A paper describes a structure:
Local refinement of the main helical cylinder in the AcMNPV capsid resulted in a 3.2 Å resolution map for the major capsid protein, which was sufficient to build a de novo atomic model for VP39 directly from the density map. The asymmetric unit of the helical cylinder is parallelogram-shaped, containing a VP39 dimer (VP39A and VP39B) with local 2-fold symmetry. Asymmetric units, which contain two VP39s, are related to each other by a rotation of ~18.5° about the helical axis and a rise of 44.1 Å along the helical axis, generating a right-handed, 14-start helix. The major capsid protein of AcMNPV, VP39, has several common elements to that of the HK97-like fold, including the E-loop linking a two-stranded anti-parallel β-sheet, a long “spine helix” in P-domain, and a distinct four-stranded anti-parallel β-sheet in the A-domain. In contrast to other dsDNA viruses where the HK97-like fold is organized with icosahedral symmetry, VP39, with its HK97-like fold protein, is found, for the first time, to be organized with helical symmetry in baculovirus. At the center of the VP39 dimer, cysteines (Cys229) from each VP39 form a disulfide bond. Residues Asn270-Pro296 in the C-terminal region, in addition to Tyr250, form a ring-like structure, creating a “hole” for the insertion of the “E-loop” from the adjacent VP39. When taken together with the intra-asymmetric unit knot, the C-terminals of VP39 form a series of continuous interactions with an “S”-like shape, linking the neighboring helical starts together. In addition to Cys229, which forms a disulfide bond between the two VP39s in each asymmetric unit, Cys29, Cys169 and Cys132 can form disulfide bonds between VP39s from adjacent asymmetric units. These disulfide bonds lock the neighboring dimers together and are likely critical contributors in the assembly and stability of the helical capsid cylinder.
Baculovirus Autographa californica multiple nucleopolyhedrovirus (AcMNPV) has been widely used as a bioinsecticide and a protein expression vector. The DNA genome, along with the baculovirus basic DNA-binding protein P6.9 protein, is encapsulated by an enveloped, rod-shaped nucleocapsid; the major capsid protein VP39 and some additional minor proteins are known to comprise the nucleocapsid. Here, we show a 3.2 Å resolution structure of helical cylindrical body of the AcMNPV nucleocapsid, composed of VP39, as well as 4.3 Å resolution structures of both the head and the base of the nucleocapsid composed of over 100 protein subunits. Surprisingly, the C14 symmetric base had nearly identical features to that of the apical head, except for that in the central regions. Both the head and base could be further segmented into three parts: an outer shell, an inner layer and a central region.
Numbering used by the authors:
A (entry chain A), B (entry chain B): 14 to 320
């Protein structure tokens, strides 16, 4: 009934022109992700999806998982999914989109100086006190109201030190972790919640048993933020297919369409019926997870967690 | 209209007891495989499935791929998918099933001595010449009629040397291959066709472009046949779930159901709607493929192929 996306309250606070809100209907779900899918695929290279864990005794249990939207020939900056604090202002080219987007992003990355600069650049204009002040305060309040819940510290911490989620394999039966954990713990609580819900483990630990869902990692935590780079090998094929983009003619991309497949393949598809198609898009997979015996996985209330 | 599975012609040539034929309806498809899915999952640890390849210019192209039916705690013999000539009679305990099954398996692995022994053991019985003679010729003729088509040599070879399928990564832009290729070329044409349609490459080569579908291998070619052992790590999780088994109560397995998941997770599934479920089962993925420029992939007529 109520939207639960940070970008859902985006407003072009000129008080004259209306504003957009392209959030998909899944934003209203209490899934734990606080970004609508459209904003997830437009702002970052991610896409919500679910990973179901089965058994032999007919039991269902599912955990969320993200997906790449990056291709092959894109290298460097274009491979970045969630840039870190140092490398976000350059990759989001913030002087292009709306002012409220800049405010939201600067709140996300704890850049208070940018917030003050946008506020005092807004202040000098005519008609600020009419509606701009109240609208910018409403946007700020909504962003804070979404940011605090994801934050672990807050006023009174509802933190559950149960799911030891380490994005590394060093002393698996311990709390020892590499610099990846230090980099991951350097994000805002919203960022940590998003990256925790986005990437699913390839090794899992419940009670005393060990589970495995992949053989090699897919992404890696870097100083340039979360980057979709396969370790030790050429980048994985990703067909991109269809995704939304800002189409208002500011500038056009070259794209340089890598594949065309000019041949005809109607008969081959016709002769192969439903065989559980198993789509070949590349999902995220990184890290080692440990679950304590006492913990529960049915806490629908969004709890930031901490390892 | 006509079944294209070897095991579809299985008949208990006693002329008194009726015969079984549990092939699924997909056996009648001209999909390239020559084993019904039911026999595929009952005799070997495979299950047919398809894998579509996309582009950016709205084109479709799909190739076959097999699936594991092996769990985690199974080690050694139970990890064997398609046993080789040396290690097939021990793993298939051939003295337990029907005689015709033994004949088929001995024809598959070019064990002519076993064929002659089964024939001259059948010869001495009463009523052999009445109908058992013609039934054993019927079974032999059908098995040979399926075996020769997959065979490359035969009478006149319809072999195409365009697809270079290497189950190794050594001198990718060359014909050099490791011992895996030598072991693979030691199988019957039926076996080669099955393992060619079962495992899909992790790198693909069309013209000059390089494609990728996995970051690390899943199975490995051994002297003990095709064994489903992931390299460099613990065995992958596989729920097994529901599969057919010989249900006549001769003996009962311990199974030792590994997971039970006593917890309740109805609400967690309720709060997550359709999010591209992405099933987490383990498919086969091994080898490097090269496609020449002029080759075609719409040949409905099955061709054994040779690298």
């Amino acid at each position: 009934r109520v939207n639960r996306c940070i970008f859902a309250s985006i407003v072009s606070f000129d008080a004259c022109i209306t504003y957009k809100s392209p959030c998909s209907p899944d934003a209203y779900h209490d899934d734990g992700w606080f970004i609508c899918n459209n904003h997830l695929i437009k702002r970052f290279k991610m896409s919500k999806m679910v990973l179901p864990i089965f058994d032999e005794d007919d039991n269902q249990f599912k955990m969320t998982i993200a997906r790449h939207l990056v291709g092959n020939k894109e290298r460097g900056i274009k491979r970045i999914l969630i840039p870190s604090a140092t490398n976000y202002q350059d990759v989001f080219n913030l002087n292009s989109m709306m002012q409220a987007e800049q405010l939201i992003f600067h709140l996300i990355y704890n850049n208070e100086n940018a917030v003050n600069t946008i506020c005092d650049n807004l202040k000098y204009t005519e008609g600020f006190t009419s509606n701009t002040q109240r609208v910018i305060h409403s946007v700020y309040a909504t962003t804070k109201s979404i940011l605090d819940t994801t934050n672990p510290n807050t006023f009174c911490s509802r933190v559950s030190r149960d799911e030891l989620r380490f994005f590394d394999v060093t002393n698996a039966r311990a709390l020892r972790g590499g610099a990846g954990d230090q980099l991951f713990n350097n994000y805002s609580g919203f960022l940590q919640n998003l990256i925790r819900r986005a990437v699913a483990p390839e090794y899992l630990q419940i009670d005393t048993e060990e589970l495995r869902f992949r053989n090699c990692a897919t992404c890696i935590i870097d100083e340039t933020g979360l980057v979709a780079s396969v370790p030790d090998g050429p980048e994985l094929y990703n067909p991109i297919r269809s995704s939304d983009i800002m189409r208002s003619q500011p500038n056009r991309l070259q794209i340089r369409n890598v594949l065309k497949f000019e041949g005809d393949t109607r008969e081959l598809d016709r002769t192969l019926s439903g065989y559980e198609e198993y789509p070949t898009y590349v999902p995220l997979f990184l890290g080692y997870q440990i679950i304590n015996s006492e913990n529960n996985f049915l806490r629908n209330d969004f709890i930031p967690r901490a390892n």
